[PDB]
């Protein structure tokens, strides 16, 4: 259905909206939801975490079963698994992990991967755990993403200062 309400355009192809992205995907039913996966798909926390346990370890059982027959994603690649409960389609996109020394231009071939979907439910990509810089991060999408992405994110104050630096 893809019935998303209460967002905020920041351009023709990129919503924003101050909610929980498992909040969202209950409500919404969309066709994809992303999730900010790592290379072995090990859903340990974060969204990755909050994701997983909302299907009740479904997305985590499915994602060993994945790994041990197709091997590890790649840093900037992506896998479509099921959405379970949240949606049609899980889009597993792994962001670099700034933290962890992964480059930072990877991140543009993290969101490239959106744009083999027509409408997405997403986070920002490598934000929280994996260090960069979430205005950094949206930037990036903005430049990058074609296709139309709604943006969930969760803390308000985030939320007040993408949206400031973007209008």
Known sequence: VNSFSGYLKLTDNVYIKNADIVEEA???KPTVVVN???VYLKHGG???GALNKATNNAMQVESDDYIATNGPLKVGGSCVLS???????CLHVVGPNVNK????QLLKSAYENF????????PLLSAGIFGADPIH????????VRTNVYLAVFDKNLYDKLVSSFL
Not at 83 to 89: M, P, R, T, V
């Open 83 to 89: 959405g379970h409960n949240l949606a049609k389609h």
């Open 36 to 38: 900010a996966a790592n």
């Open 137 to 144: 991060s949206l930037r990036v999408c903005v430049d990058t």
């Open 101 to 104: 020394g992964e480059d930072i």
């Open 46 to 48: 974060g969204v990755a």
């Open 115 to 122: 744009n083999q979907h027509e409408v997405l439910l997403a």
């Open 26 to 28: 209950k409500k919404v």
